[PDB]
Amino acid sequence: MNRGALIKLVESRYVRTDLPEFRPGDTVRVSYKVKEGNRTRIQDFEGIVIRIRRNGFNTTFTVRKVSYGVGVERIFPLHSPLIQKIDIVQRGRARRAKLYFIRNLSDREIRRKLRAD
Amino acid sequence: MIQPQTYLEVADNTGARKIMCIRVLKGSNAKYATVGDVIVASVKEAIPRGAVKEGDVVKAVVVRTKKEVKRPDGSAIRFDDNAAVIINNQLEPRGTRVFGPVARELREKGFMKIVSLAPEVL
Amino acid sequence: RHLKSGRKLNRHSSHRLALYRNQAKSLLTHGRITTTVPKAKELRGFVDHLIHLAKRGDLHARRLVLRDLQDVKLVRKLFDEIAPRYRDRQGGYTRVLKLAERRRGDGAPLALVELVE
Amino acid sequence: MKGILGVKVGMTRIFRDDRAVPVTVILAGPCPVVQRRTPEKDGYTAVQLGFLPQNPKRVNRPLKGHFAKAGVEPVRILREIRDFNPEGDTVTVEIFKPGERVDVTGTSKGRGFAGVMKRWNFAGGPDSHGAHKIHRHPGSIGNRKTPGRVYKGKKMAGHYGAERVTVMNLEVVDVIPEENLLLVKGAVPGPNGGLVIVRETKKAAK
Amino acid sequence: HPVPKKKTSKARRDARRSHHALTPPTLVPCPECKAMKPPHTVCPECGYYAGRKVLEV
RNA sequence: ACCGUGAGGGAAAGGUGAAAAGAACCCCGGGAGGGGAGUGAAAUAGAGCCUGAAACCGUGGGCUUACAAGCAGUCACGGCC
RNA sequence: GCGAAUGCCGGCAUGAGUAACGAUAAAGAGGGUGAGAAUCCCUCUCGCCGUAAGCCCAAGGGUUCCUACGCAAUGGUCGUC
RNA sequence: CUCGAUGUCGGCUCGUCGCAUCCUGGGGCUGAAGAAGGUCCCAAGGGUUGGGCUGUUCGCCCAUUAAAGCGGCACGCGAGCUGGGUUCAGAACGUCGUGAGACAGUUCGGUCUCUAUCCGCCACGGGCGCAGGAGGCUUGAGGGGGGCUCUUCCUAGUACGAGAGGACCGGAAGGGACGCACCUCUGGUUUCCCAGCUGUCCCUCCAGGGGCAUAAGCUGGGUAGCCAUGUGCGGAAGGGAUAACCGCUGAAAGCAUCUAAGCGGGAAGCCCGCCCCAAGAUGAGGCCUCCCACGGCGUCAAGCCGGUAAGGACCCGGGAAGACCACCCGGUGGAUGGGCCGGGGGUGUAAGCGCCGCGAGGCGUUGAGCCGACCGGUCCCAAUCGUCCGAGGUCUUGACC
Predict the structure, then answer these.
(1) Taking Cα atoms as reference points, which of D88, D121, A25, A21 lies closest to residue A33?
(2) B72 near D CB under 8 A
């Protein structure tokens, strides 16, 4: 019973699936739109593209910093169910080894290297 | 994420996108040039011409790297540390500047100009 | 800091694994062996999992625990010698039990523990 | 205004248009195990239990203390004053309405025995120009002829975990009437999967 | 460096040695033969509960 | 003896008994050592063993002691024995 | 004829059954011999040396080395080593 | 007193009281319009930042700040550090000295020990007791913890107004610092969780592994626990006495006065309200339930024995509780551990054979493989058997039946 049980439950309650979207993939830079908004309920299907970085897993989870070269390096981290989300579509490839936090990217990247993977 | 003494980045009418702040402009007990805050500093880095100089202003907090945790559980981090220089009132320094969007900023609000100003990729 | 603690042991992880094994081995040899209180306790947990693969019974499994004990004689010795004998119960193939006395000089409480027939 | 509970675990949730985090309160439902009538204990109040751990295991006394107004077969019990029992059995399946403010407490997870380091704030001493004590150690303790000795009540090393305590206001967030559970966004006062209680006081004028 | 002052008499010495004191050894009889057995144990005789597997040689 | 390189410094320990008759032998024990038999005038004269006290630690008994602040004590008195 | 002189010589106390065992180069098993074996013997797992924890000549030590019995003293407890 | 011995500076760390109170408020006063100052009496509540240079505390300076106080305790702190210091020999010169040597002129280095006995503080236990023997729930006299402050805005830009400018009263939101808990989330760890790697001796050559490369050789990530830099919360109300200071009713001073008389106003302070201890408060225990008056002896038989599992202790086995200990749940009529199993979350597609390349390896079966503390199943194993201690119920008075 206990924890596992009851809790599993309440969450199931609220989050339900984070909106069946189960497209994780390690690599894949990809793109989405979160409601993220302010100013006159300007909740905007805002879409950021980002090279897939990491994640938290259980009730509460999060599609991690996918780093995005904006013109400086900006990495974007976002909670998974987090009703906050609407569109979440992949573009990139779910490839590469050593598993996540492979910031190798954000760090010494270098477009070339980037592609080097 | 924060700092007192600091080698920070900017990109306004900068002498150089870099100045060292003393501390936080908030509630007398600084300890955090924190995201979206306002604080104190002088230049560290050079400045071709430019009316900027090797002085000291105060201004407002951009980027950080160690958790931009927002109200909506919006989350982010840029491998960059920088804010925009202020002229008194706050009224920003330069005509433009190299950087972009995201809540925290506008949210602090007082600086809409910065707001519309740094938009696109970079 | 410390309190809520799992897998509880002494000496030094290398020393330990060292023992766990050496012992797991010697017991495998004699069915029953004599040492000190937890020597047994934990040794149970361990030689324990080993017999578990002993049972596992297959080219791979074999490959593994061998990975750990290093040496055919026993390798097979267990894997086929008794692994069958057990393959059918629900683990706990260990019988850890408190002898009559305590080694000298100190009074270290000891016992015999073995494959539980 | 009081709930008796088996504190579950802490977890995150969402509200309005934003996530935030809560905690899992669970309580079958204590019952009038003992009443201090006032003429009884002019410190008038209600004592209750809220579960049941094995019956084959149970002192006679317990058996009949229960006998009293007779109720069930548990062991979790305690008391609180100035709280009527407009019932003779309580659950919370409503007992505790959400969108309300609460106060609550519980057992306090059990620390260890760490000095100036733990126990109190300020992490020890310093480290380098001095290492015949490297980084931290005990502050100072009194003096020559001031009191002429060693003081009597400043913080002190050691055991500072096996105790109990509570938290002031917190939010009632949500009510799950079935599995007698409630999410409250709380300082998980003390462990979890263990013991706690809630009470509500706050004539607080903002 | 900090050698006391004297010794509050055997008196004290005791006070201490005293709260100290030496208790005795737990035991019941062999679940099998007789003599003293501490809780879970066997010995140079009976030696069991299900298979002496012990004593005599 | 023993410290110092050498020069050199430089302890301690006297007695069992009257005479050896100073301990066959039996018994717990690896042994020591421990109970007996014999010694004898004694062996609380038993081998470091005459006389063998103070100090300190011990086994039993008497009185005494858990709301107590005093070198000590001690004058008084009351309860124990 | 003596408290008394941080006295002189010899006992006997005290913190203390806490500080400490001389290197963080680890050891675990099985059987053996024994009055008793963590601490001896074989044998089996295992770590640390190896450029030394190698061997070698020499110095200086001067018993001991061996083989056989024994352990009350001695090893910083063990201990049939 | 001290020379049979008392460590002197500066700083550190933990500070503790004090008011001639700095910020706080309460105030009468103004040369007080407002605002803002400034002028005294009351009141320590909390609070009473960073750096710079200087061995200097003082100080001067940078930036803020509500504010960035004076000082008591051998100028608190060496049995708790630090030790630049001035103050053992050096050597330096600058300076005296006929020179030996010297200068509170200076400058470079310059061997600070500490196994706690006492009373004292921090904790945790063993007693023995608060005259039945018991399992458990309480109420607190009395003691402990925290009581700070900024800015935005409504009222409200009207009270003041020439104007520039800003108000009692009272009401919202955000924050700094700090105190209390706590991991979901955020990030930190994770000596074995997983994964990659060189060198090397070993297994059996090949792969597939193995110890050593620290007590993990190295690397990249990594639960769970613990933990900030992450999260909730808190410093309130509000009740009663009052400080300065304001008044009511009123004489003695046949007009007057707050003034002994009698009444009220009033401070972020005092008692409470807030949490945390607590009858070893011998002045409790209050309530609940429950076992009943056993045997034999000189009597106030308040001494000796089995006694009730009434209950508990012991041993075992388990614990975010934990040095030991006590606390806590359990012992097989159980799930308590470990085991196993299902599952989470970890690693990042194994081992082999198979498919393209002389080869390096590449692709397939593979997001496989292997896994420690996290939810929970199932007696696979080990919580067997036992033991011991633990009421009979003082005298006395009053009351009821």
Answers:
(1) A21
(2) yes
